[PDB]
Amino acid sequence: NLNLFATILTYPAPASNYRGESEENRSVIQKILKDGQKYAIISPESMRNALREMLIELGQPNNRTRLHSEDQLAVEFKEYPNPDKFADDFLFGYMVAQT
RNA sequence: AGAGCACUUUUAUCACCGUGUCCCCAAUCUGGAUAUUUUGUGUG
C-alpha cells in the first residue's frame, strides 16, 4: 500500500547528447536559466524509448518497433492492444482513432 | 484521478603538410689584525 520512488546518479564523463536545432556551424544543447547559468537537459522521451528498448531486449514481448526506414523514421509493427498482457508493458496504450 | 502531455534530434567524418635564435666579449686596478700581560700560594 506504498509507492516508493528513488533518485539515481551517474559517474562523470564527457557529454555526448546533441539537441539539434543547429545554428550556423555548431550543434547546440538546450539550456535552462536555473540561477542565471547554463545546464544540460535530457528529455524524458528518450529515456522512455531506452527503457522500452531494454524491455524488448530482455525478451519481454511487445507490439511496437521503430525501424530504420529508408525515407524517414517511423513506428510500426503494432496491432489492436485489446489485452494489456503481451502488449505495451502495462504502460501507455495510447489511441486517438474513432474507428 | 490535473483543458487525455509520449511515439524523432535521428545516422557517418585525421587541421593536415615542410622550418639551426643565430654570430663576437678580462670584474679589471692597491692594502703589516695590529699594541702590553709571573698559574702564582704551602703539606713525613
Side-chain angles (χ1 to χ4, degrees), chain A residues 47-78:
Chain A
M47 311 195 327
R48 296 278 192 83
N49 189 359
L51 265 295
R52 184 172 286 124
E53 170 53 48
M54 293 180 183
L55 273 295
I56 200 177
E57 194 205 327
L58 294 175
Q60 309 321 106
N62 52 345
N63 300 134
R64 171 189 176 285
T65 54
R66 43 166 288 183
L67 60 86
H68 299 83
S69 277
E70 59 275 14
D71 44 356
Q72 63 84 30
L73 73 165
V75 162
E76 46 255 24
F77 182 74
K78 62 178 70 176

PDB file of all heavy atoms in Angstrom, chain A residues 47-78:
ATOM      1  N   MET A  47      14.603   8.673 -22.661  1.00  0.00           N
ATOM      2  CA  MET A  47      14.731   7.694 -21.589  1.00  0.00           C
ATOM      3  C   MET A  47      13.623   6.652 -21.643  1.00  0.00           C
ATOM      4  O   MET A  47      13.872   5.462 -21.417  1.00  0.00           O
ATOM      5  CB  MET A  47      14.722   8.426 -20.256  1.00  0.00           C
ATOM      6  CG  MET A  47      15.682   9.601 -20.229  1.00  0.00           C
ATOM      7  SD  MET A  47      15.948  10.151 -18.548  1.00  0.00           S
ATOM      8  CE  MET A  47      14.323   9.763 -17.915  1.00  0.00           C
ATOM      9  N   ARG A  48      12.391   7.078 -21.928  1.00  0.00           N
ATOM     10  CA  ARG A  48      11.305   6.120 -22.111  1.00  0.00           C
ATOM     11  C   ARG A  48      11.604   5.172 -23.264  1.00  0.00           C
ATOM     12  O   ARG A  48      11.357   3.962 -23.173  1.00  0.00           O
ATOM     13  CB  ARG A  48       9.992   6.857 -22.366  1.00  0.00           C
ATOM     14  CG  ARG A  48       9.505   7.716 -21.216  1.00  0.00           C
ATOM     15  CD  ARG A  48       8.774   6.898 -20.165  1.00  0.00           C
ATOM     16  NE  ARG A  48       8.070   7.750 -19.213  1.00  0.00           N
ATOM     17  CZ  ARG A  48       6.870   8.272 -19.425  1.00  0.00           C
ATOM     18  NH1 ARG A  48       6.212   8.055 -20.551  1.00  0.00           N
ATOM     19  NH2 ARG A  48       6.319   9.038 -18.487  1.00  0.00           N
ATOM     20  N   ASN A  49      12.120   5.714 -24.366  1.00  0.00           N
ATOM     21  CA  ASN A  49      12.467   4.889 -25.517  1.00  0.00           C
ATOM     22  C   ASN A  49      13.559   3.890 -25.162  1.00  0.00           C
ATOM     23  O   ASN A  49      13.503   2.726 -25.571  1.00  0.00           O
ATOM     24  CB  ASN A  49      12.904   5.783 -26.679  1.00  0.00           C
ATOM     25  CG  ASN A  49      13.079   5.018 -27.979  1.00  0.00           C
ATOM     26  OD1 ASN A  49      12.899   3.803 -28.038  1.00  0.00           O
ATOM     27  ND2 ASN A  49      13.440   5.738 -29.034  1.00  0.00           N
ATOM     28  N   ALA A  50      14.561   4.329 -24.400  1.00  0.00           N
ATOM     29  CA  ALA A  50      15.620   3.421 -23.972  1.00  0.00           C
ATOM     30  C   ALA A  50      15.072   2.316 -23.077  1.00  0.00           C
ATOM     31  O   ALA A  50      15.476   1.154 -23.192  1.00  0.00           O
ATOM     32  CB  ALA A  50      16.717   4.202 -23.251  1.00  0.00           C
ATOM     33  N   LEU A  51      14.152   2.663 -22.175  1.00  0.00           N
ATOM     34  CA  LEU A  51      13.537   1.646 -21.328  1.00  0.00           C
ATOM     35  C   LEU A  51      12.756   0.632 -22.155  1.00  0.00           C
ATOM     36  O   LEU A  51      12.849  -0.577 -21.916  1.00  0.00           O
ATOM     37  CB  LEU A  51      12.631   2.304 -20.288  1.00  0.00           C
ATOM     38  CG  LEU A  51      13.261   2.567 -18.919  1.00  0.00           C
ATOM     39  CD1 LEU A  51      13.600   1.246 -18.262  1.00  0.00           C
ATOM     40  CD2 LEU A  51      14.500   3.440 -19.024  1.00  0.00           C
ATOM     41  N   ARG A  52      11.980   1.104 -23.133  1.00  0.00           N
ATOM     42  CA  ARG A  52      11.241   0.178 -23.987  1.00  0.00           C
ATOM     43  C   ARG A  52      12.193  -0.703 -24.788  1.00  0.00           C
ATOM     44  O   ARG A  52      11.932  -1.896 -24.989  1.00  0.00           O
ATOM     45  CB  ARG A  52      10.306   0.949 -24.917  1.00  0.00           C
ATOM     46  CG  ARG A  52       9.430   0.055 -25.775  1.00  0.00           C
ATOM     47  CD  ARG A  52       8.391   0.857 -26.532  1.00  0.00           C
ATOM     48  NE  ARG A  52       7.317   1.320 -25.661  1.00  0.00           N
ATOM     49  CZ  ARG A  52       6.963   2.590 -25.520  1.00  0.00           C
ATOM     50  NH1 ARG A  52       7.582   3.556 -26.178  1.00  0.00           N
ATOM     51  NH2 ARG A  52       5.961   2.896 -24.702  1.00  0.00           N
ATOM     52  N   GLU A  53      13.305  -0.128 -25.250  1.00  0.00           N
ATOM     53  CA  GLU A  53      14.309  -0.902 -25.969  1.00  0.00           C
ATOM     54  C   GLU A  53      14.909  -1.983 -25.079  1.00  0.00           C
ATOM     55  O   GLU A  53      15.168  -3.102 -25.534  1.00  0.00           O
ATOM     56  CB  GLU A  53      15.399   0.031 -26.496  1.00  0.00           C
ATOM     57  CG  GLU A  53      16.619  -0.678 -27.048  1.00  0.00           C
ATOM     58  CD  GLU A  53      16.259  -1.707 -28.099  1.00  0.00           C
ATOM     59  OE1 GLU A  53      15.471  -1.377 -29.009  1.00  0.00           O
ATOM     60  OE2 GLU A  53      16.762  -2.846 -28.013  1.00  0.00           O
ATOM     61  N   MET A  54      15.153  -1.666 -23.809  1.00  0.00           N
ATOM     62  CA  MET A  54      15.686  -2.675 -22.899  1.00  0.00           C
ATOM     63  C   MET A  54      14.663  -3.767 -22.614  1.00  0.00           C
ATOM     64  O   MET A  54      15.018  -4.949 -22.534  1.00  0.00           O
ATOM     65  CB  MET A  54      16.157  -2.022 -21.606  1.00  0.00           C
ATOM     66  CG  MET A  54      17.352  -1.141 -21.827  1.00  0.00           C
ATOM     67  SD  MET A  54      17.964  -0.329 -20.353  1.00  0.00           S
ATOM     68  CE  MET A  54      19.258   0.630 -21.114  1.00  0.00           C
ATOM     69  N   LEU A  55      13.392  -3.396 -22.450  1.00  0.00           N
ATOM     70  CA  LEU A  55      12.361  -4.409 -22.245  1.00  0.00           C
ATOM     71  C   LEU A  55      12.237  -5.331 -23.452  1.00  0.00           C
ATOM     72  O   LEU A  55      12.077  -6.547 -23.296  1.00  0.00           O
ATOM     73  CB  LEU A  55      11.018  -3.759 -21.911  1.00  0.00           C
ATOM     74  CG  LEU A  55      10.722  -3.422 -20.442  1.00  0.00           C
ATOM     75  CD1 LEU A  55      10.642  -4.710 -19.635  1.00  0.00           C
ATOM     76  CD2 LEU A  55      11.740  -2.485 -19.817  1.00  0.00           C
ATOM     77  N   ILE A  56      12.311  -4.779 -24.667  1.00  0.00           N
ATOM     78  CA  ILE A  56      12.291  -5.645 -25.842  1.00  0.00           C
ATOM     79  C   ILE A  56      13.594  -6.425 -25.975  1.00  0.00           C
ATOM     80  O   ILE A  56      13.616  -7.482 -26.616  1.00  0.00           O
ATOM     81  CB  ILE A  56      11.994  -4.847 -27.129  1.00  0.00           C
ATOM     82  CG1 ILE A  56      11.497  -5.783 -28.233  1.00  0.00           C
ATOM     83  CG2 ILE A  56      13.222  -4.114 -27.623  1.00  0.00           C
ATOM     84  CD1 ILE A  56      11.120  -5.074 -29.516  1.00  0.00           C
ATOM     85  N   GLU A  57      14.682  -5.937 -25.376  1.00  0.00           N
ATOM     86  CA  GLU A  57      15.956  -6.642 -25.443  1.00  0.00           C
ATOM     87  C   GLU A  57      16.008  -7.838 -24.502  1.00  0.00           C
ATOM     88  O   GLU A  57      16.677  -8.831 -24.807  1.00  0.00           O
ATOM     89  CB  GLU A  57      17.104  -5.682 -25.128  1.00  0.00           C
ATOM     90  CG  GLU A  57      18.478  -6.223 -25.487  1.00  0.00           C
ATOM     91  CD  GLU A  57      19.583  -5.599 -24.661  1.00  0.00           C
ATOM     92  OE1 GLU A  57      19.456  -4.413 -24.292  1.00  0.00           O
ATOM     93  OE2 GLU A  57      20.580  -6.297 -24.378  1.00  0.00           O
ATOM     94  N   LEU A  58      15.316  -7.769 -23.367  1.00  0.00           N
ATOM     95  CA  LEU A  58      15.373  -8.834 -22.374  1.00  0.00           C
ATOM     96  C   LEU A  58      14.404  -9.973 -22.661  1.00  0.00           C
ATOM     97  O   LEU A  58      14.343 -10.923 -21.874  1.00  0.00           O
ATOM     98  CB  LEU A  58      15.106  -8.268 -20.977  1.00  0.00           C
ATOM     99  CG  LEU A  58      16.168  -7.312 -20.435  1.00  0.00           C
ATOM    100  CD1 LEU A  58      15.736  -6.717 -19.104  1.00  0.00           C
ATOM    101  CD2 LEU A  58      17.505  -8.023 -20.300  1.00  0.00           C
ATOM    102  N   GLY A  59      13.649  -9.903 -23.754  1.00  0.00           N
ATOM    103  CA  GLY A  59      12.749 -10.970 -24.136  1.00  0.00           C
ATOM    104  C   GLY A  59      11.293 -10.745 -23.798  1.00  0.00           C
ATOM    105  O   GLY A  59      10.469 -11.622 -24.084  1.00  0.00           O
ATOM    106  N   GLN A  60      10.947  -9.612 -23.205  1.00  0.00           N
ATOM    107  CA  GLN A  60       9.551  -9.328 -22.894  1.00  0.00           C
ATOM    108  C   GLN A  60       8.804  -8.976 -24.174  1.00  0.00           C
ATOM    109  O   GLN A  60       9.220  -8.055 -24.889  1.00  0.00           O
ATOM    110  CB  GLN A  60       9.449  -8.189 -21.884  1.00  0.00           C
ATOM    111  CG  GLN A  60      10.313  -8.374 -20.646  1.00  0.00           C
ATOM    112  CD  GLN A  60      10.341  -9.811 -20.163  1.00  0.00           C
ATOM    113  OE1 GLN A  60      11.336 -10.516 -20.332  1.00  0.00           O
ATOM    114  NE2 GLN A  60       9.245 -10.254 -19.559  1.00  0.00           N
ATOM    115  N   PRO A  61       7.720  -9.673 -24.505  1.00  0.00           N
ATOM    116  CA  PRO A  61       7.011  -9.385 -25.756  1.00  0.00           C
ATOM    117  C   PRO A  61       6.390  -7.998 -25.752  1.00  0.00           C
ATOM    118  O   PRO A  61       5.992  -7.468 -24.712  1.00  0.00           O
ATOM    119  CB  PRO A  61       5.931 -10.474 -25.814  1.00  0.00           C
ATOM    120  CG  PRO A  61       6.383 -11.530 -24.848  1.00  0.00           C
ATOM    121  CD  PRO A  61       7.124 -10.804 -23.776  1.00  0.00           C
ATOM    122  N   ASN A  62       6.310  -7.411 -26.944  1.00  0.00           N
ATOM    123  CA  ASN A  62       5.698  -6.103 -27.123  1.00  0.00           C
ATOM    124  C   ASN A  62       5.249  -5.979 -28.572  1.00  0.00           C
ATOM    125  O   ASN A  62       5.527  -6.844 -29.406  1.00  0.00           O
ATOM    126  CB  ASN A  62       6.661  -4.974 -26.746  1.00  0.00           C
ATOM    127  CG  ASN A  62       7.992  -5.089 -27.448  1.00  0.00           C
ATOM    128  OD1 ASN A  62       8.323  -6.135 -28.007  1.00  0.00           O
ATOM    129  ND2 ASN A  62       8.766  -4.011 -27.426  1.00  0.00           N
ATOM    130  N   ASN A  63       4.549  -4.887 -28.861  1.00  0.00           N
ATOM    131  CA  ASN A  63       3.938  -4.654 -30.166  1.00  0.00           C
ATOM    132  C   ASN A  63       4.221  -3.238 -30.651  1.00  0.00           C
ATOM    133  O   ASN A  63       3.320  -2.501 -31.054  1.00  0.00           O
ATOM    134  CB  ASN A  63       2.436  -4.918 -30.115  1.00  0.00           C
ATOM    135  CG  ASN A  63       2.109  -6.340 -29.704  1.00  0.00           C
ATOM    136  OD1 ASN A  63       1.246  -6.571 -28.857  1.00  0.00           O
ATOM    137  ND2 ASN A  63       2.801  -7.302 -30.303  1.00  0.00           N
ATOM    138  N   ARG A  64       5.490  -2.833 -30.612  1.00  0.00           N
ATOM    139  CA  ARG A  64       5.879  -1.522 -31.121  1.00  0.00           C
ATOM    140  C   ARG A  64       7.369  -1.524 -31.419  1.00  0.00           C
ATOM    141  O   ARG A  64       8.178  -1.775 -30.520  1.00  0.00           O
ATOM    142  CB  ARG A  64       5.547  -0.416 -30.114  1.00  0.00           C
ATOM    143  CG  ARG A  64       6.126   0.936 -30.485  1.00  0.00           C
ATOM    144  CD  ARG A  64       5.967   1.947 -29.362  1.00  0.00           C
ATOM    145  NE  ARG A  64       6.612   3.218 -29.679  1.00  0.00           N
ATOM    146  CZ  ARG A  64       7.922   3.424 -29.649  1.00  0.00           C
ATOM    147  NH1 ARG A  64       8.767   2.461 -29.324  1.00  0.00           N
ATOM    148  NH2 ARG A  64       8.395   4.627 -29.954  1.00  0.00           N
ATOM    149  N   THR A  65       7.731  -1.244 -32.671  1.00  0.00           N
ATOM    150  CA  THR A  65       9.133  -1.146 -33.056  1.00  0.00           C
ATOM    151  C   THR A  65       9.330   0.028 -34.001  1.00  0.00           C
ATOM    152  O   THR A  65       8.516   0.255 -34.900  1.00  0.00           O
ATOM    153  CB  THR A  65       9.635  -2.429 -33.737  1.00  0.00           C
ATOM    154  OG1 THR A  65       8.777  -2.756 -34.836  1.00  0.00           O
ATOM    155  CG2 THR A  65       9.669  -3.593 -32.755  1.00  0.00           C
ATOM    156  N   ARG A  66      10.418   0.768 -33.801  1.00  0.00           N
ATOM    157  CA  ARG A  66      10.819   1.842 -34.706  1.00  0.00           C
ATOM    158  C   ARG A  66      12.058   1.375 -35.461  1.00  0.00           C
ATOM    159  O   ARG A  66      13.147   1.279 -34.885  1.00  0.00           O
ATOM    160  CB  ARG A  66      11.078   3.146 -33.953  1.00  0.00           C
ATOM    161  CG  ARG A  66      11.865   3.011 -32.659  1.00  0.00           C
ATOM    162  CD  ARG A  66      12.361   4.372 -32.184  1.00  0.00           C
ATOM    163  NE  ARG A  66      13.436   4.886 -33.025  1.00  0.00           N
ATOM    164  CZ  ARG A  66      14.090   6.019 -32.799  1.00  0.00           C
ATOM    165  NH1 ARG A  66      13.795   6.794 -31.768  1.00  0.00           N
ATOM    166  NH2 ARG A  66      15.063   6.383 -33.629  1.00  0.00           N
ATOM    167  N   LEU A  67      11.887   1.077 -36.743  1.00  0.00           N
ATOM    168  CA  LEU A  67      12.964   0.573 -37.580  1.00  0.00           C
ATOM    169  C   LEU A  67      13.561   1.696 -38.422  1.00  0.00           C
ATOM    170  O   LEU A  67      13.027   2.803 -38.505  1.00  0.00           O
ATOM    171  CB  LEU A  67      12.458  -0.574 -38.464  1.00  0.00           C
ATOM    172  CG  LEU A  67      11.311  -0.315 -39.448  1.00  0.00           C
ATOM    173  CD1 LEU A  67      11.802   0.226 -40.787  1.00  0.00           C
ATOM    174  CD2 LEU A  67      10.488  -1.580 -39.650  1.00  0.00           C
ATOM    175  N   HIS A  68      14.693   1.388 -39.055  1.00  0.00           N
ATOM    176  CA  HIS A  68      15.424   2.359 -39.868  1.00  0.00           C
ATOM    177  C   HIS A  68      14.806   2.397 -41.264  1.00  0.00           C
ATOM    178  O   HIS A  68      15.287   1.777 -42.216  1.00  0.00           O
ATOM    179  CB  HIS A  68      16.905   2.011 -39.915  1.00  0.00           C
ATOM    180  CG  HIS A  68      17.570   2.029 -38.574  1.00  0.00           C
ATOM    181  ND1 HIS A  68      17.520   0.962 -37.704  1.00  0.00           N
ATOM    182  CD2 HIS A  68      18.297   2.988 -37.952  1.00  0.00           C
ATOM    183  CE1 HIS A  68      18.189   1.261 -36.604  1.00  0.00           C
ATOM    184  NE2 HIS A  68      18.671   2.485 -36.730  1.00  0.00           N
ATOM    185  N   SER A  69      13.711   3.142 -41.378  1.00  0.00           N
ATOM    186  CA  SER A  69      13.050   3.312 -42.663  1.00  0.00           C
ATOM    187  C   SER A  69      13.932   4.110 -43.616  1.00  0.00           C
ATOM    188  O   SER A  69      14.706   4.979 -43.205  1.00  0.00           O
ATOM    189  CB  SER A  69      11.703   4.011 -42.485  1.00  0.00           C
ATOM    190  OG  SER A  69      10.693   3.085 -42.122  1.00  0.00           O
ATOM    191  N   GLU A  70      13.811   3.798 -44.908  1.00  0.00           N
ATOM    192  CA  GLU A  70      14.657   4.445 -45.905  1.00  0.00           C
ATOM    193  C   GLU A  70      14.299   5.917 -46.077  1.00  0.00           C
ATOM    194  O   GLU A  70      15.183   6.754 -46.294  1.00  0.00           O
ATOM    195  CB  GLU A  70      14.557   3.701 -47.239  1.00  0.00           C
ATOM    196  CG  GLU A  70      13.151   3.621 -47.821  1.00  0.00           C
ATOM    197  CD  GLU A  70      12.352   2.450 -47.278  1.00  0.00           C
ATOM    198  OE1 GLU A  70      12.771   1.857 -46.262  1.00  0.00           O
ATOM    199  OE2 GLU A  70      11.301   2.124 -47.868  1.00  0.00           O
ATOM    200  N   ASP A  71      13.013   6.257 -45.983  1.00  0.00           N
ATOM    201  CA  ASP A  71      12.573   7.633 -46.196  1.00  0.00           C
ATOM    202  C   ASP A  71      12.752   8.485 -44.941  1.00  0.00           C
ATOM    203  O   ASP A  71      13.515   9.457 -44.946  1.00  0.00           O
ATOM    204  CB  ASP A  71      11.112   7.646 -46.660  1.00  0.00           C
ATOM    205  CG  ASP A  71      10.239   6.697 -45.862  1.00  0.00           C
ATOM    206  OD1 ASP A  71      10.780   5.968 -45.005  1.00  0.00           O
ATOM    207  OD2 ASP A  71       9.011   6.681 -46.092  1.00  0.00           O
ATOM    208  N   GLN A  72      12.060   8.128 -43.863  1.00  0.00           N
ATOM    209  CA  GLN A  72      12.157   8.850 -42.603  1.00  0.00           C
ATOM    210  C   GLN A  72      11.636   7.945 -41.497  1.00  0.00           C
ATOM    211  O   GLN A  72      10.789   7.080 -41.735  1.00  0.00           O
ATOM    212  CB  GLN A  72      11.393  10.181 -42.665  1.00  0.00           C
ATOM    213  CG  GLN A  72       9.888  10.066 -42.884  1.00  0.00           C
ATOM    214  CD  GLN A  72       9.120   9.830 -41.600  1.00  0.00           C
ATOM    215  OE1 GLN A  72       9.537  10.268 -40.529  1.00  0.00           O
ATOM    216  NE2 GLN A  72       7.992   9.137 -41.701  1.00  0.00           N
ATOM    217  N   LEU A  73      12.155   8.154 -40.287  1.00  0.00           N
ATOM    218  CA  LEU A  73      11.913   7.219 -39.195  1.00  0.00           C
ATOM    219  C   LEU A  73      10.437   7.179 -38.817  1.00  0.00           C
ATOM    220  O   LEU A  73       9.746   8.201 -38.819  1.00  0.00           O
ATOM    221  CB  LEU A  73      12.764   7.590 -37.977  1.00  0.00           C
ATOM    222  CG  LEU A  73      12.406   8.811 -37.122  1.00  0.00           C
ATOM    223  CD1 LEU A  73      13.151   8.743 -35.798  1.00  0.00           C
ATOM    224  CD2 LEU A  73      12.712  10.120 -37.836  1.00  0.00           C
ATOM    225  N   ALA A  74       9.955   5.982 -38.490  1.00  0.00           N
ATOM    226  CA  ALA A  74       8.554   5.784 -38.153  1.00  0.00           C
ATOM    227  C   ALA A  74       8.428   4.589 -37.219  1.00  0.00           C
ATOM    228  O   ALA A  74       9.333   3.759 -37.115  1.00  0.00           O
ATOM    229  CB  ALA A  74       7.694   5.582 -39.405  1.00  0.00           C
ATOM    230  N   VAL A  75       7.287   4.517 -36.539  1.00  0.00           N
ATOM    231  CA  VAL A  75       6.987   3.457 -35.584  1.00  0.00           C
ATOM    232  C   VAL A  75       5.897   2.576 -36.176  1.00  0.00           C
ATOM    233  O   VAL A  75       4.859   3.079 -36.620  1.00  0.00           O
ATOM    234  CB  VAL A  75       6.552   4.032 -34.226  1.00  0.00           C
ATOM    235  CG1 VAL A  75       5.841   2.973 -33.403  1.00  0.00           C
ATOM    236  CG2 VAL A  75       7.750   4.584 -33.474  1.00  0.00           C
ATOM    237  N   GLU A  76       6.132   1.269 -36.189  1.00  0.00           N
ATOM    238  CA  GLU A  76       5.184   0.329 -36.771  1.00  0.00           C
ATOM    239  C   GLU A  76       5.287  -0.992 -36.013  1.00  0.00           C
ATOM    240  O   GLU A  76       5.828  -1.046 -34.902  1.00  0.00           O
ATOM    241  CB  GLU A  76       5.438   0.176 -38.281  1.00  0.00           C
ATOM    242  CG  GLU A  76       6.901   0.001 -38.655  1.00  0.00           C
ATOM    243  CD  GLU A  76       7.504   1.258 -39.257  1.00  0.00           C
ATOM    244  OE1 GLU A  76       6.984   2.359 -38.986  1.00  0.00           O
ATOM    245  OE2 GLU A  76       8.498   1.142 -40.005  1.00  0.00           O
ATOM    246  N   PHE A  77       4.770  -2.059 -36.626  1.00  0.00           N
ATOM    247  CA  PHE A  77       4.651  -3.378 -36.005  1.00  0.00           C
ATOM    248  C   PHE A  77       3.812  -3.290 -34.728  1.00  0.00           C
ATOM    249  O   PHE A  77       4.284  -3.503 -33.611  1.00  0.00           O
ATOM    250  CB  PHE A  77       6.029  -4.003 -35.749  1.00  0.00           C
ATOM    251  CG  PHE A  77       5.975  -5.383 -35.144  1.00  0.00           C
ATOM    252  CD1 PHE A  77       5.616  -6.474 -35.918  1.00  0.00           C
ATOM    253  CD2 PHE A  77       6.321  -5.596 -33.818  1.00  0.00           C
ATOM    254  CE1 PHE A  77       5.570  -7.744 -35.374  1.00  0.00           C
ATOM    255  CE2 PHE A  77       6.277  -6.863 -33.269  1.00  0.00           C
ATOM    256  CZ  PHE A  77       5.903  -7.939 -34.048  1.00  0.00           C
ATOM    257  N   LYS A  78       2.546  -2.925 -34.919  1.00  0.00           N
ATOM    258  CA  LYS A  78       1.579  -2.877 -33.835  1.00  0.00           C
ATOM    259  C   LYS A  78       0.259  -3.447 -34.329  1.00  0.00           C
ATOM    260  O   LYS A  78       0.010  -3.541 -35.532  1.00  0.00           O
ATOM    261  CB  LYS A  78       1.377  -1.450 -33.308  1.00  0.00           C
ATOM    262  CG  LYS A  78       0.835  -0.471 -34.331  1.00  0.00           C
ATOM    263  CD  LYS A  78       0.613   0.892 -33.699  1.00  0.00           C
ATOM    264  CE  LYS A  78       1.932   1.570 -33.376  1.00  0.00           C
ATOM    265  NZ  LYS A  78       1.728   2.944 -32.847  1.00  0.00           N
TER     266      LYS A  78
END
